[PDB]
Write a protein that binds this ligand. Structure first.
Ligand SMILES: Cc1nc(C)c(O)c(C(=O)NCC(=O)O)n1
Ligand SMILES: [Cl-]
Ligand SMILES: [Fe+2]
Length: 211
């Protein structure tokens, strides 16, 4: 609809992402890339699935299966654009996300929960200070109905009187602190559920992790 207009990355970062993250440690952004780009990502992810590029998560350690995407691979061009779009937002968050100085990230982890009641038990992404400070997730599930299909990400922010229910909605982008501040679970999914995750590194924590 031609009455709607995209917020520039700088505007979205400073007017929303930064304050929301510093206040709540969780930030949801809907309509990130638009319908055309979102569906195209859906196509690329389904292709990865169909061509058998996923490994079951019980080997990586949960009924998930995952594939790592660098972004430049043939057939992953749009996933690549998503990743550069994520980077753009983080860049504009300057050094305003707490006291972090982000200088790098993981590749993209494409995850599939193949319905059949599969999910992910309550966990912390980075409990052992491995350098990862911000989790960034993009969902690409067309017309997801959590009332029927489930698959809600429930986040339990540490020491807060509230929790967050995040439906894995088409074209939804999500940020949260990767550390113990945000334990979270993926509730059982009863339809094919896809997500793409990148983790951003804090320079010092990442350095102290391997050094
Ligand atoms: C560490 C880890 N590994 C996998 C495979 C995940 O799927 C998640 C997660 O929190 N997923 C959240 C979501 O998809 O809404 N975390
Ligand atoms: Cl508020
Ligand atoms: Fe997680």
């Amino acid at each position: 609809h031609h009455h709607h207009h995209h917020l520039p990355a700088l505007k979205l970062a400073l007017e929303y992402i930064v304050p929301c993250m510093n206040k709540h440690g969780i930030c949801v952004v809907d309509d990130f890339l638009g319908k055309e780009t979102g569906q195209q990502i859906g196509d690329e992810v389904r292709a990865l699935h169909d061509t058998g590029k996923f490994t079951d998560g019980q080997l990586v350690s949960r009924g998930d299966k995952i594939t790592w995407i660098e972004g430049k691979e043939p057939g992953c061009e749009t996933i690549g654009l998503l990743m550069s779009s994520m980077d753009d937002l983080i860049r504009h968050c300057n050094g305003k996300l707490g006291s972090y100085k982000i200088n790098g990230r993981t590749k993209a982890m494409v995850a599939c929960y193949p319905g059949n009641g599969t999910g992910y038990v309550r966990h912390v992404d980075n409990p052992n200070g491995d350098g990862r400070c911000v989790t960034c997730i993009y969902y690409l599930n067309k017309d997801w109905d959590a009332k029927v299909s489930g698959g809600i990400l429930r986040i339990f922010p540490e020491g807060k009187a509230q929790f967050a229910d995040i439906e894995p909605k088409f074209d939804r982008l999500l940020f949260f602190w990767s550390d113990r501040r945000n334990p979270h679970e993926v509730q059982p999914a009863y339809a094919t559920r896809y997500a793409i995750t990148v983790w951003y590194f804090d320079a010092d924590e990442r350095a102290r992790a391997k050094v």
